[PDB]
Design a protein around this ligand. Structure first.
Ligand SMILES: Cn1c2cc([S@@](C)=O)sc2c2cnn(Cc3cccc(N)c3)c(=O)c21
Ligand SMILES: Cn1c2cc([S@@](C)=O)sc2c2cnn(Cc3cccc(N)c3)c(=O)c21
Ligand SMILES: O=P(O)(O)OC[C@H]1O[C@](O)(COP(=O)(O)O)[C@@H](O)[C@@H]1O
Ligand SMILES: O=P(O)(O)OC[C@H]1O[C@](O)(COP(=O)(O)O)[C@@H](O)[C@@H]1O
Ligand SMILES: O=P(O)(O)OC[C@H]1O[C@](O)(COP(=O)(O)O)[C@@H](O)[C@@H]1O
Lengths: 514, 519, 517
């Protein structure tokens, strides 16, 4: 009668659906990470404190706009807010900083200011920089020098986040003649999309380069790399991060058809993925976005790599204290699909109800996690699981199976790098995975993985290693008792390794909570 | 292989199925999920209604929370005029149903400053007196708000939360009174006229069927509506009341019960048993229960309806942003697709079509998403589970239905063609959720219109006179269906289709499945 | 009844747990029974009783007997079968199968006698000779064999197995036209016993001179199928097909798999054949006996997946040669063959030579009937469907539809009108629980139908009615009358009927769900 446990026992998915129960309350623990974009609505230390209390796990900084000075201050504010809770390490929640790059863009020039484009009219594009400052009703300059190479007669060109739609009729040397499909107001310096085109713009812009160096300087936890189209774009980002940035997680943002097409190579080269639905729905028909989303979430779950669902999840909450019914549904279905994290953009950056937006994602996620059909999900994740000789992988699956057999309150995992805990998360237990680490960055980065509740042990290192291990297990028991995940006498699963250092998790214990 | 998500269709696991979903895999022409559009000022002209039918509208919903009988009579006439403008060629005629959505036990606010269009914008932390003094029913403003629920005090209690306008404005009761409440604006916004008011956690003792509802149901009978969407159904006796009010004259009208509150969810099984179908009325629902639990209730009701073989509609805010914008949000794309994947027979538009700036674009977008989502269903497991979950019965029509759907998967058939007088034989096929469209050929125009409630049914109304020889009459209808599919691009000459008929005239005798190539 | 409680289990494990010895089966037995005819079972009198007890196919073994002897056996089987033809409701078609000798190797005669035996002691010496002067003077010192090439294919260390693999020899000196061996497994050595050489590459023809004569004899006697011995590869099968010629083109070739090479090359052999016999006697000598069940299950599964008949053969009810009841291992084996998915089960010595031939047939009947009810059709049908291509063939669509409908209403039968049998075969391949009553006017189609699990062929002999709808109705009523009389169903039960939209072969597209009148 709690946790949708009745629905969880159903022999079929249809009967599982029929058993879902609005009167079956969820556990306390919410497994899906919440990523909040920070902006004018959410930037103060006092608001950030409430965001953390409301459930923010990751603070996202959008580098499309704003100076390094500004973002540095934002990051400082985030850290001040986070560390205000530091004094009680049992209740302290790590908060990660994510840098989302501007990435390469196609832009128009200066009009004549705005101008009107009428449905059916003719409209030349030129790369002749003499028209850079002189765009108008008959003529439009663009900054992408190689556009004629990458688009054909009959192709479509979108301008100003998709408001405007053109069709290429003539394809010359340094020019294109087009008819205006979707007319409207044409401003200056607008963004241009090219659906279906293989855009050959660099993997990282001049500004992205400076921006990633700033990320390393500022000790960010992860980078959301914009407009990733191929594996080699991920490598160029990785090479720019370099030795100083080598522990920074690269999450690839899939934003166009080519990125969807070449998804498998991108996934293999990345630490995780963001389904950037905003830009993706400009580039592919909006009715196909759910397909791409479900496909990418499935493949990420199969590979055991974090996937973030992004953009317009609770959009109406920019203006309103409650979301639309479509928005509640979108969030629940992203969690049911398998998304590791869900994200807020305008809802937390600019909106009037940023705390309400964060609270709603937390509430829905928690209800949605209880409603997953773990019986089939776990069987399927096993079957598609390769048989290998890696001891930590066998221990992980063993722990998750044990956790289902005894409905443990948690799986406690000692981890330095986070990997042991990620290997458990990939099998999607129902039980929260309390990842105990002394590495503050690991604690921050753990949020990317569904089910991981990171805790940062600050206790001094004991001289006897077995005692230092027992010290950290007990810390995890105290965190669980305090947050109400379980109580004395409940059963939990504990994972440790055979020696200090990373790579040696091979020990699973089923233990009473002291 | 590379159309209709057939690579995904063949996956041995649901996880692998998801992994194979392909944006470059184009759907078939036929869209199975019915689209219900609310008609109002933006869409009630004949001219616009014609374009709604071309864009995909199957049912025209009339919302009796507003408007006079004269107003709704004319909307209905316009719907029929637009629908019959296509009747000259019976092969391309699309039937359109008329649905009456009852007002039911509502609480509504009054007019702002005596105007239905006037608004005040309110601020958080203000004071607002509510009143039942009918002297203020058209003098609602920043300070005084009139409500039509005469028993408001009861029920209500101090500290209770009162919600106005689709839950967007929130008031908290600081003090009770004889016929007045005193409140603080917990959440601000622009307050308008005749807005819906909710009292979650209060026992609203308003009748199941008010005198206005009785007036409206009588009108629906007189106007020959196809279905009634009954508001705020709480228990089986509510459904029986509507059925007895409709009486003999309304005995063929379908009753769709709207589940809009906590008691309706709890008592869902007896409501379903009593009803002809269900609407998941998410607007009120997500105010009466926590918004975060609406998806649970939605998926439970779609599941139980699918298991019962009764139609279920998912309603409210599916493409809400399209009221002001030509393109929906990504959440709205997802919401429509996920309703279809859940198993919803029909999807609905309200303000998007009733009063928005882009009613045609909203109908088109629902058509497009529905069709993409229908190809993405994991039929392999779905059909296995519907088969397993259905009892082993002696009913010959039920055996033929499952046989037909099985055969339709085996040959990836262009259609399942079903002859039906009442619709039932076509409903029995729809229940097993074939990929193929079901072409239901009838001579009963009501059956034609009502069959849109069922996933996958494309009703076609045969106009040809009855032939003296019954076998020739049957064959005439089968060929009409052949002609319709080909004109619509469902299939071409030499494609294989499944054909369902009976062994004698009249309802209840469907027992014959034939697998026939398209001539 | 019919283990229907077990049938509804959501798991194979729970299905087993629900099997119930107090749940009686239906009357219908879907698994064909093939009986080997010999002196125990050859008279018309005894063949009539065999038919009553459930024989569907009479196998003649051409390892022994003259063309004159076998023609007489065939006449007796045909006389036996046609004695029931006075009552069309009760007539059962019985097929005739010819089983070739193939490239066998045989020893000679112990001391000039067909019954004499000698004792071979473990470790004692035995000289094998090809000197035809010892052809009828075999004893414990010298044994003659009829494979003249045995010396150019075995090597010192080689093993040679004699008499159903009960006696084992090891070559300790290889000669010119001789071998010297030491007896590993001793015992009683008799005359004209079978010899095998596992690991040896035997140089004998796929189809010998005598084999050719026998296959031509088959064509002339109008047999229904041929069981072709020791098929090692596809080209062996094409050789049998070639001898059968255009005149015997409708005769079913069942490839008998009896050695390692046959198993290894199974897929090419199955694609060439009309069916398969798991010939377990020779197979369990050519390969280790403990591996035979693997081969049996691989072969039954591959045949079920290809939709081709498969027969399980040899030693199924062995002890019943001397005893009126079987061992527990034999009850288990017949049942498990049926659960594996064998279309037919066979008897050899049990019916040919043994003391209790009617009891062996009756036992196979009783066991098969219980085991068919114990099949987990829920998973079987689901796998067969999934492992089935999406096709444009209307008859296939109709067939899978009819099987689905038969499960939905637990139909008393699926009735199928068929000229060539193909339509009924297409239904059988999806393994319905309901019996498939195949109504044909073609006597060969009715006889060959017995090779497919589930098919109960009935031969309609009434003249073709001018009105086609009435001719179809006539046959459907005939199938209803047969089923009633046999207790497959009663008035008020529901049956599935499959027909075409016109007369002639290849038009099956119509399924109807009808009450039994
Ligand atoms: C949503 N869904 C569906 C739908 C169908 S068809 C009968 O409409 S079967 C099925 C199904 C099975 N399992 N799970 C859990 C699961 C399994 C594999 C991957 C994920 N993400 C989630 C599911 O989530 C799940
Ligand atoms: C023998 N068998 C069968 C047969 C069928 S139907 C197509 O004739 S499905 C199936 C099946 C499935 N699993 N296993 C392994 C198993 C599972 C559960 C209990 C036992 N003893 C053995 C089986 O052993 C097993
Ligand atoms: O998840 P990682 O990075 O592999 O770390 C897991 C490691 O943590 C431990 O449990 C504890 O190690 P430490 O004492 O070095 O922190 C090791 O036995 C184990 O290998
Ligand atoms: O779905 P329903 O209402 O039972 O109608 C199906 C009926 O239609 C038919 O196929 C044709 O009947 P009619 O000629 O009376 O229209 C009957 O054979 C069958 O019983
Ligand atoms: O299995 P086959 O050889 O295709 O025979 C099936 C045929 O039998 C029938 O049901 C009846 O045919 P007949 O009237 O010629 O016997 C046909 O309609 C159908 O095509």
């Amino acid at each position: 009668q709690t946790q949708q446990l009745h629905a969880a026992m159903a022999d079929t998915f249809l009967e599982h659906m029929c058993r879902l129960d609005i009167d079956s309350p969820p556990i306390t623990a919410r497994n899906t990470g919440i990523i909040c974009t920070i902006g004018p609505a959410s930037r103060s230390v006092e608001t950030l404190k409430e965001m953390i209390k409301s459930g923010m796990n990751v603070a996202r900084l959008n580098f499309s706009h704003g100076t390094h000075e500004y973002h540095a201050e934002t990051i400082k504010n985030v850290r001040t807010a986070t560390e205000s809770f530091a004094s009680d390490p049992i209740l302290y929640r790590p908060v990660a900083v994510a840098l989302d790059t501007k990435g390469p863009e196609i832009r128009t020039g200066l009009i004549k200011a705005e101008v009107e484009l009428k449905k059916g009219a003719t409209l030349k594009i030129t790369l002749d920089n003499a028209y850079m400052e002189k765009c108008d009703e008959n003529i439009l300059w663009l900054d992408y020098k190689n556009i004629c190479k990458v688009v054909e007669v009959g192709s479509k060109i979108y301008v100003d986040d998709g408001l405007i739609s053109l069709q290429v009729k003539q394809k010359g040397a340094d020019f294109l003649v087009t008819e205006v499909e979707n007319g409207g107001s044409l401003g200056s310096k607008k963004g241009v999309n090219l659906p279906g085109a293989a855009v050959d713009l660099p993997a990282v812009s001049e500004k992205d380069i400076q921006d990633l160096k700033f990320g390393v300087e500022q000790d960010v936890d992860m980078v959301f790399a914009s407009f990733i189209r191929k594996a080699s774009d991920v490598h160029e980002v990785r090479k720019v991060l370099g030795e100083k940035g080598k522990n920074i997680k690269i999450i690839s943002k899939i934003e166009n058809h080519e990125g969807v097409r070449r998804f498998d190579e991108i996934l293999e080269a990345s630490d995780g993925i963001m389904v950037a639905r905003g830009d993706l729905g400009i580039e592919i028909p909006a009715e196909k976005v759910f397909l791409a989303q479900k496909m990418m979430i499935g493949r990420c779950n199969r590979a055991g790599k974090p996937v973030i669902c992004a953009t317009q999840m609770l959009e109406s909450m920019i203006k309103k204290p409650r979301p639309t019914r479509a928005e509640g549904s979108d969030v629940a279905n992203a969690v049911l699909d398998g998304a590791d994290c869900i994200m807020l953009s305008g809802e937390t950056a600019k909106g009037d109800y940023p705390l309400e937006a964060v609270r709603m994602q937390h509430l829905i996620a928690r209800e949605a996690e209880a409603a997953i059909y773990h019986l089939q999900l776990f069987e399927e994740l096993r079957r598609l699981a390769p048989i290998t000789s890696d001891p930590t992988e066998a221990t992980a699956v063993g722990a998750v199976e044990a956790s289902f057999k005894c409905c443990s309150g948690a799986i406690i995992v000692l981890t330095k790098s986070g990997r042991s805990a990620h290997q458990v998360a990939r099998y999607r237990p129902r039980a929260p995975i309390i990842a105990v680490t002394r590495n503050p960055q690991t604690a921050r980065q753990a949020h990317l993985y569904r089910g991981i509740f990171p805790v940062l042990c600050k206790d001094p290192v004991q001289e006897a290693w077995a005692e230092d291990v027992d010290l950290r297990v007990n810390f995890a028991m105290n965190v669980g008792k305090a947050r109400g995940f379980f109580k004395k006498g409940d059963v939990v699963i504990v994972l440790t390794g055979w020696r200090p250092g990373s790579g040696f998790t091979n020990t699973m214990r089923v233990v009473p909570v002291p």
